[PDB]
Subunit: 362 residues, 4 copies
Amino acid sequence: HMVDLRSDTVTRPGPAMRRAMAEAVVGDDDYGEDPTVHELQEKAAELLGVERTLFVPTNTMANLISVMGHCRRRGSQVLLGQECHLHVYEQGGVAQIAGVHSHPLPDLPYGTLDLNELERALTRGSGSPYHPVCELVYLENTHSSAGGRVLPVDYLRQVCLLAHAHGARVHMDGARLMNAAVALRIPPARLVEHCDSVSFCFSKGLGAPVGALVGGSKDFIGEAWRLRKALGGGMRQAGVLAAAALVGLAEAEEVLPRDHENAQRFAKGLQDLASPICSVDPATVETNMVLVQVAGLPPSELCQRLQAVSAEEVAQTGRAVRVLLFPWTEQSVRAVWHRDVSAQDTELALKKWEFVLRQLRP
Amino acid sequence: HMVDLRSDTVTRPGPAMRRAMAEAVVGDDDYGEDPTVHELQEKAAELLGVERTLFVPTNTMANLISVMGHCRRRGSQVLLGQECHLHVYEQGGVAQIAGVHSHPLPDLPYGTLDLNELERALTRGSGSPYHPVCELVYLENTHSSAGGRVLPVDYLRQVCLLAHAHGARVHMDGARLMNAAVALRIPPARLVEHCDSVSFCFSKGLGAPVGALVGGSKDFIGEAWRLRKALGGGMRQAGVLAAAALVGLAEAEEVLPRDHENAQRFAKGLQDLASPICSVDPATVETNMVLVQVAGLPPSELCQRLQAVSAEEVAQTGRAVRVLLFPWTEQSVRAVWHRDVSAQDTELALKKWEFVLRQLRP
Amino acid sequence: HMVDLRSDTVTRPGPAMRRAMAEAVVGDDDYGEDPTVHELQEKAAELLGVERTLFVPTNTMANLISVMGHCRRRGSQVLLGQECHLHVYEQGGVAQIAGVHSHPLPDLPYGTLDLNELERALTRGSGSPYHPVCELVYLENTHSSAGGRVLPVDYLRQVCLLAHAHGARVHMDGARLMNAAVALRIPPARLVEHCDSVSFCFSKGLGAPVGALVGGSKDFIGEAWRLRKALGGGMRQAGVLAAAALVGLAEAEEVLPRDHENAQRFAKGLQDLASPICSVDPATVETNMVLVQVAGLPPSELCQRLQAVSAEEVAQTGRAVRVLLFPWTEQSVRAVWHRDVSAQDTELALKKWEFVLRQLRP
Amino acid sequence: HMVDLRSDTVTRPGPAMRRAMAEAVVGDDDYGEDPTVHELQEKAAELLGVERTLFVPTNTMANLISVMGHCRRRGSQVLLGQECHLHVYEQGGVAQIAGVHSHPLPDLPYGTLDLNELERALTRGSGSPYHPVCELVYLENTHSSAGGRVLPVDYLRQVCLLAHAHGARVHMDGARLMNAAVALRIPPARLVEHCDSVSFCFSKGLGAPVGALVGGSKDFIGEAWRLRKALGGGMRQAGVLAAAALVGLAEAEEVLPRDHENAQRFAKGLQDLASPICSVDPATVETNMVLVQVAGLPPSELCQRLQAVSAEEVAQTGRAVRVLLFPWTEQSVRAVWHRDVSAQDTELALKKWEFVLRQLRP
Ligand code: NA
Ligand code: NA
Ligand code: NA
Ligand code: NA
């Protein structure tokens, strides 16, 4: 048995998705003739509260397009977080493709930026021609590096007021925006109301194989077409991929709560072990991610034992569970849940954790 | 009835493709865990005679990655054709994304570059620190703007000898490389032997919904991984798309000849009309493209009548055929054939052409 | 003795210039406090018929700033000549710094672009989102690679009408704009009336050691300040350099005619030699440049003998004149006159030419 | 009377400089024919312990060239300080011109980077293909935003050891490197030994009108020639500017100590006032900069009164001193000394400060 808790991208297509792709009325998206792409775009337009949307291959390109479509002035700056995906895990494309300066701000605890330091950054070069013009504030809901932490609607409101005052636009990396709205029990459009543009991934928690989109005003999405074309994302018969995305877009309000519940149950069960090696605050688990603090054991070696299977595991637990994880920081590991991790898989991992912890118990 | 001859991109998935997508063993390609992507990559590596390949969303990104991975020096130049796809229909991404200077050379007749002007250009900045360092010679086989003209193997050899002498690499835009190998009756690797890297489109004549790849040495493809990731093409479960691509890769050497025959038959049938309005030399038709010279009628109005249907069309011909075409030059229109145009569709178009020409015969 | 006819950049400061630099009321140009910079900027503003000007280190940066300030849209194109300085001798900075696509057009004979091919290029992507947006037409008066050929006021008018129709701006590389206006006997502002922006070099024919400027509307020059700052041209006490430039700006209408007369006299004297090796049409000499066609002798080797001095030269001519030149094409060499070449130096070179030609006379 | 303490850039040419410019043996530096440029370059090479140097218009271009010549890989990162000049006051040219990602680290107190956060950053993407390749560590000696704080030789050594271990190069922004070497009483080459490249400004404390240079190995400076040419800094007769630079380079080890003494004396005199409004620790004054902490008064209004002159100022002090200063932070102002501020000017400022403080003493 294998429980892959490394990321929510490993979701494989389900039966409904696989048929939807093969039963998809397709066309040339470059000519604007794929109806299944057109459906996904307009369904997500109402879901996200934006005028238009634009299907893109990845959410990485979705962010790259947004930065390029907002930060167009030569000498423009984006205000972003120090541990957001755009700054860390996107090859620095803000500079090597967009040519836009980045001023990162701290946000590690709760995925939020200090609105005082935001005001300080938005005002330092508010008019001076000696400083780059900050034209975009980049937010991440949920924040992946912080542990899937939800950004409150109130924090979203304040950021925009501060940004829109100093003449800057607001984009939200909504790679896990459905996870945030599921946790807050609010419609997803209430989080995007306080934004100019948004990104949205289908390949993560929703279960789709490939797909993402940019959302915003009709003009911003119209300018986004040329940027998607130039970056290499002008696919032809992409209604094959939009069909599976439409299925997961409809199954979000029933699949994602299960991943949050499995995350909470795991965090509780791991806390009920009281081990000096591993510590988890079940209240930090806001969505489908559990950040486990490891002490005394290198996070890489803990993952190695959770993935390994020994005869003694079959002695105490009875099963052979290979728990797959990623070491996140130097003292922590990250587990992420999805629709392909069952609730009994969650219990199987907890028992694998029990065995592993006891073997390395101080 | 409707015959879409605007481009070979409008190829829609067949039943075998649609089943292959839904029956695909998929995984996270970003982690290198999609086996169907690995299969398509390894099959095309042997087909093209390259060490490795890399599945990308479009051939536009495949070309962009090749330029970026070859023209890396600050102050680098690419030698390309004046009417090649990279120079005209890719939003100038060689400059706005790659930051690479372009020196275009004429290529309109046969898709070939004058080896004298190439040698002169390769020598002007061979050592001078006042000129950019030419690091890539960009070729297009087949050449789309010229009418799918095939580049001879000997011409390919000479270009490399001239380039490899002055320390430049050779990339071939093989968006229609399978069409070239079918016309030349040679395996595709014999055209790529005289290259460092190559591009290869699946979404055109091969019938796939989405997909392309970059080919070359293992080192070049390893550098291509970061460029695909940074440009936004690092998809996750892309074995869904690779599965349909594998079907078209196996059906190419039997589907594309039918498209060449339909193109030749159409050009002949148009030549057997002897009309002063339209003229086509059936010897210029080397592949699946027919460049029709228009006289007396603006090329846009010819396309409008071929798509339109009138009561008199049902009087003279008996059917209602909507032939879809794109005006190409100021005095010509471009027709491109694919697997979704049947041989009787070609005859239906020829009859629609007859009617249109006869109404405005002067 | 030495007559350097390689370029007009080798002009060394005169006595009036050297005192003007040492007697210059200077200040911090970055703070806008250098009055000698302010004087040169406003004097050139009236001279060129522009609202404002901006002193820059080189004319290379002046062009780079103009392209950046006009071609600001992501996916913008500049229409320029194939043998203009921006395309050939500026390290392809239109792409590697500005990130702007370049569509070069032929202009070799008279430095003019075929207005039909200009219309064709300005219309091909006039609205299509598949093509880059042409936002700048780049002209060169005089054209250096063509042999200092003057662009007529009428040709300037037509280009602008064609450009301003399709919503593009016009910049003129006026590195030798005073040479053009001196030849046409018109004030320099009459050539810039048909332009949006202009460049202007002081280090060439005017005699200054360092300096250039960008001219245009007050907004374009205000946006140019940030671009000059970012590229590294925000000098501090540059009134030292502006003072020498103001001297040459006042001495242009008395120094430059002498360089044109010496060029014509040389071309005549060389034509009155009737040598099969060298040929010069004295009517192609429009300004201070003479393009000498060489046949039977590699242009590099002719320059080597003109620079060399032998005992036999002292036998036939009596003097030891080292004529310094540049081989320009594969069958031509380029001579350029300036204020540091005297009229007797011109006669000394012609005699050195006589001797050299006779030694290699077929 | 007027004391300009806003920056050390306002240094105006002295008589020896003004004579040196007018007595300069100049030539075309682009052809490598300006001997005075060659002299300044060779003298600074021995002074800084580098193989070669390259005269550039500004130190902004010198830094831009260094970043471009080090951070050349597509997907490269520079490790720099959060308040360093490259990150704040250079229009983000690291991205909008160089296309290089920036990971800034805190440095506000002592201008030093936390070697733990540096090691952590140098290891996060030491091999991972998901992270940009860190190729340059950027240091600033002295650190301008921190108040001219000197970086110790030992701290410089450790940074290189950490960088050279993880395969990164070290560049030092030596805009005020002579101020650092005067404070440390060491030859300047001992600070540059722990570097690959360095920058060096002449227009600041040294007194020159215009000029700076890049230093490093012969190969790095050879690559710097094309970058200086492409950015627009390839001047012709720059021995005019190099001549004045040679004067300040020889007068540095006797002029800069006077500026350090005036800064210390001022800070002491301000400390001997014991005012609740303004506070300065004279031990933070390491060079020619005094960071004055302001309380109760917005820093802008303090500068307005120090520049203003009233009848009561002539009543209490007897003179009319206009002290020119820049508000630096939200609670501080920055004073910088240079050769054009005399020791009695410092006493006149201190008396102007006394008056201003006493009027608003609470
Ligand atoms: Na997925
Ligand atoms: Na297709
Ligand atoms: Na000069
Ligand atoms: Na100065």
